[PDB]
Assembly symmetry: C3
């Protein structure tokens, strides 16, 4: 108990897929990380004709990435603004006790709460809202879930215990939504989250999502929201899915070092084509880009990637290596 002598670092969170500033290898001993976030409830557009009455941490789906190191403390201030219409809370799978923080952070619109917990376990972990009861799933599939990554104090290590570093970390937040359709087969729009609850419950109960998206919308990470790398970059892709499985794959690439259950002191596997993110967790994969051009990072049920929304692109620069792959003879008539 105590802590008056640990340093405090106050952070400014940035919207996903980017991450707030940090260091892989901790620059000093345990600190108290201070974070603040508000619940913003608002309608979001998931696709060209599909909308969700969302509930979100800081206005974005997923909520922003938090990064700290193992042995640190996390003190979060959570605000539920007076214009929201429901109570929210927050459960950190990285924390120990009271339902992850969920039993000490229930706040009604108009209130705030400050939770502290010590980040004893290294890994990426989901956090998400869980107000109690029959509503808990409904708040997660309305968008309130993000991730906090607890890095080991000395940074990541590989399956032999040797240090490894990434040049860039992107947080891909995947989320399943259950938008109801009226009779003519078109998506329904509602005036706030409650009005749409009962119709959304009926679709939830079939367990088939109408949309599975990265970063909050079909296309959020393609086009202008494409991810970027260079040949030689070691990139860390952190991938959460708070309520339903996912099987990520980098098309054209591999997972060089993968922790698919997400906890960095376990040995990562090598050379994977596809890995698996259990619903309710965050895993992480490093890949060093060896060829330039366009890559798609997708949930490899391709129906879920292409029809429901779970595809991102990565644009990579650099020179092409024909010894890895060559079009020996371009398409030509038989």
């Amino acid at each position: 108990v105590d802590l008056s002598n640990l340093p405090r670092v106050k952070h400014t969170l940035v919207p996903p897929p980017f991450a707030h500033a940090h260091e892989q290898v901790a620059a000093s001993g345990p600190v108290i990380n201070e974070f603040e976030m508000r619940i913003i409830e608002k309608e979001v557009q998931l696709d060209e004709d599909a909308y969700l009455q969302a509930m979100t941490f800081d206005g974005s789906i997923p909520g922003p990435l938090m990064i700290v190191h193992e042995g640190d403390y996390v003190e979060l201030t959570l605000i539920n603004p007076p214009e929201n219409t429901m109570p929210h809370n927050i459960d950190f799978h990285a924390a120990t006790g009271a339902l992850g923080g969920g039993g000490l952070t229930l706040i009604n619109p108009g209130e705030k709460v400050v939770l502290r917990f010590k980040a004893t376990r290294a890994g990426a972990f989901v956090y998400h809202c869980a107000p109690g009861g029959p509503m808990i799933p409904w708040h997660v599939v309305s968008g309130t879930a993000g991730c906090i990554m607890v890095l080991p104090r000395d940074g990541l290590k590989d399956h032999e215990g040797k240090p490894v570093r990434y040049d860039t970390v992107y947080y891909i937040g995947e989320s399943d939504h259950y938008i109801p359709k009226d009779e003519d087969g078109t998506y329904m729009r509602f005036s706030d989250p409650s009005e749409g609850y009962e119709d959304m419950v009926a679709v939830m109960d079939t367990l088939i999502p109408s949309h599975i998206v990265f970063n909050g919308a079909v296309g959020a990470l393609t086009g202008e929201g494409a991810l970027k790398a260079k040949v030689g970059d070691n990139v860390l892709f952190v991938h959460s899915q708070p309520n339903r499985d996912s099987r990520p794959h980098l098309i054209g690439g591999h997972g060089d070092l993968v922790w698919e259950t997400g906890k960095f002191h376990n040995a990562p596997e090598r050379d994977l084509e596809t890995w698996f993110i259990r619903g309710g967790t965050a895993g992480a994969a490093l890949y060093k880009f060896l060829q330039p051009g366009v890559y798609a990072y997708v949930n490899h049920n391709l129906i879920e990637a292409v029809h429901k929304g779970a595809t991102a692109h990565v644009l990579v620069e650099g020179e092409w290596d024909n010894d890895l792959m060559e079009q020996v003879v371009a398409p030509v008539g038989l």
Copy 2:
């Protein structure tokens, strides 16, 4: 072949989630463990307005937990009472040959059979009914599946080969069920399994369970059936799912050592938030309770946890530790 010289230990099974008396470190060489079970067909109540025409081992869903040590033998007398209507048999995934024992145990109402098999392989394994052909999935989703845990002779070891011990083991048997609905949307009830076979088959073919439950029924392991520990107990959660995947998570806690594919000579992973039970298997996770309070053990597709029934609670005694977690500022007005 032979065996007349090994000792014989006759056990009395107990209802899940508890386990019959046993020891973690084999208190001698190989013994033949004698068990006896009946099949009981009966209607059971899954939820406030949902029932299933069940077929069960011993009266319960899941069937009771058997516990033996690697290299023992298992001699089970299975009885099919005259009052059942259908043939039943049992397939032990822990056993080698004749379809897990299903090919040597098919018995009609009024008959018994006695199968012996050597438990050559350590881990938690599913056993379930498998009468033959198209009826295998229907018997399983009507309730006939349980678990046998074959412990290594010298007890469990962590990922460094060091001995770890649990103070308590709980058997969580998870089961998906496909209860059909009539035109008004309410669940149907039948006079026997046959009569609801056709209707059931149609919900089976959609692959969407109506109910996914621990211990045979919505709330079976909450309220009076909540699981209990104290701070400092090391608890072993053995989790089966004989027909569909699950992704267990202890909310407020973690898997300190987890064998999600359930076979103890594999190394276990540490610090998991959520782990993954493949349909058709049992896994097992050890956690040492650090904080007191209520914890929910759930299947973390939270629609399945809370709409379909896959939630258990644990009430744990003891003293709170504010250094792991603290409500620094209780909910207050902005």
Copy 3:
């Protein structure tokens, strides 16, 4: 870059579940393995009353297994005959760049393409067609996916790095299909893939397959297509599923060494009852048969195994071992 000095090996692919000739341990240094495949579009029969306007590599579902060794090159001539009706390409999850080769092998009916890539990573790997867009899932669930196994040069090793060898390798390609039904409830048949496109899209969007099959059809690996072994054979089962997860289980056996994410420089697990093939990948499992008789190799959601089609059988000859299992009392009246 270069290669004019490496030996070139020309292979003759065979229909799954068999494999073309190959040595487990490479008998020479890196070679260029040349393979040729045509796309064949044809209506195939998936079950007594269900058909699929299929698109296939070389006329089988799965496409045929390719075996090479780590550090070899692979140079495939892919051919899209003039009678076909759509463009096709190929994406090898074994390869690095240009979307697995799919950005270099897009060919219209009446064309061929020659793609060479270096098989840098050891493991079994899915390959599949992915022409671009919205169509990608639809070509893969119309059948165009097989597997390449890139064996370490020194063949397979156990969990401690020691040599293990298989006497037989079978390739079990599992594929999910989404055959639409008309109002009377019967499956529809169509004149070519295009015509049945929009109907098939609407079943695909439920994410519920109508059929889940091994080797292209229900019962394809049963009866006359059953797999065969004798007691003491070590049989390697390579299992691919390009678009959806599967949980294979050998009923009456176990996985003795399983790489469920399929990459052989990761250590295998042992004694599994059921393992997990993530959609978008292939895994593999070694088992030494110990008992003679019929075994079922299944996808252990039993609905998927029996209702939907994912059951194959294995007929094993040899002497029965009573010490592993014995019917001590045959069914008798109480």
